[PDB]
Amino acid sequence: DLPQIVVVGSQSSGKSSVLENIVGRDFLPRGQGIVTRRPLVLQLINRQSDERLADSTDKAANLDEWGEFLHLPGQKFYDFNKIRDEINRETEAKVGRNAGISPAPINLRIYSPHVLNLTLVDLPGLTRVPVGDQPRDIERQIRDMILKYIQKPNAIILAVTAANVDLANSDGLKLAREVDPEGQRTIGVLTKVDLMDEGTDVVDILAGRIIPLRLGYVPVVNRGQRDIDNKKPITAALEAEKAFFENHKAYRNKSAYCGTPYLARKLNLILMMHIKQTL
């Protein structure tokens, strides 16, 4: 149907962290062995610019930003800690906790003056060894779920790989190549650039010398686990990401092509081009 950006990669590649960095505020459940177990179809809606904010545990809530769930019609979520709770609820309701997965999507809209018009689909990450109560063929079930999404020619494939692993072992690029070998609709993200072995960088990847992608790669820096535990706001994380690329010798002169702000503009631009070619 409509074009959308499907986020694919290994478990703990940083897929959920990228979505939070794009939104600008944290709203996804994490910790306690919690991972994405249902597709989150996230629709971001730009919207240029009190009793409704009375019972808010989110210090940043405001009337210009809120979320809406398709299965909870009429409700507007101004507190993003309740968005997290509801996502955790809907997931456990259909697939319990730390068990298998379900293809039933959770549909969430978020209005904001700070987001571009994008549709992103967070998919479960590939793992290799079952833990907890997972079915022993959990790897196959996740692969088959991903392929069903990215086989569709309207799907823009956001292949997420951690920069502190060998690019050639990327699950995201493998799956992207299986359905889109020419790279016509695959765009890469390189996370955890701040965790790279000292002396290494991703410049060779950006210059197309390893696994070329015509739509390119974008390096980013999301919140680390310490930042999550300390409740560091995404706004501060974005400031930290900007400073990282502007003071690193390898990225200083190319920093306009680094970071989540550029990724969002790039996804928005690619998404508009993809629509133009639909008749």
What values do phi and psi take at 65, rounded to 5? -135, 135
Is position 35 an interface residue for ligand GDP (rule: CB under 6 A)? yes
Is position 82 an interface residue for ligand GDP (rule: CB under 6 A)? no
192 carries a ligand binding annotation: yes
| Nearer residue to ligand GDP within complex by CB, 192 or 274 | 192
Least spacing, CB of residue 151 vs Mg ion, in Å = 20
31 carries a ligand binding annotation: yes
End-to-end Cα distance, the chain = 11
Task: Produce one character per residue of 229-254: b if its CB has 16 or more CB atoms within 10 Å, e if not.
Answer: eeeeebeebbebbbebbeebebbeee
| Nearer residue to Mg ion within complex by CB, 144 or 204 | 144
> What does the alpha-carbon distance between residue 72 and residue 57 come to, in Å, rounded to a whole number?
20
15 carries a ligand binding annotation: yes
Q: Which range touches ligand GDP (CB under 6 A), out of 28-36, 97-105, 149-157, 172-180? A: 28-36
Is position 12 an interface residue for ligand GDP (rule: CB under 6 A)? yes
Scan for tokens 């571009």, then name that residue. 116
Is position 192 an interface residue for Mg ion (rule: CB under 5 A)? no
Is position 13 an interface residue for ligand GDP (rule: CB under 6 A)? yes
Binding mask 87-126 for ligand GDP (x = CB under 6 A): --------------------------------------x-
Is position 62 an interface residue for ligand GDP (rule: CB under 6 A)? no
Size of the site for ligand GDP (CB under 6 A): 22
Q: Which range touches ligand GDP (CB under 6 A), out of 10-18, 80-88, 95-103, 250-258? A: 10-18
Q: Which range touches ligand GDP (CB under 6 A), out of 109-117, 143-151, 192-200, 264-272? A: 192-200
Helices (H), 6-111: 15-23, 80-95
> What does the alpha-carbon distance between residue 19 and residue 91 come to, in Å, rounded to a whole number?
18
Instruction: Select from 92, 118, 114 the least CA-distant residue to 104.
Output: 92
> What does the alpha-carbon distance between residue 169 and residue 192 come to, in Å, rounded to a whole number?
16
> What does the alpha-carbon distance between residue 137 and residue 100 come to, in Å, rounded to a whole number?
9
Residues contributing to the annotated binding site: 12-17, 30-31, 36, 122, 192, 194, 197, 222-223
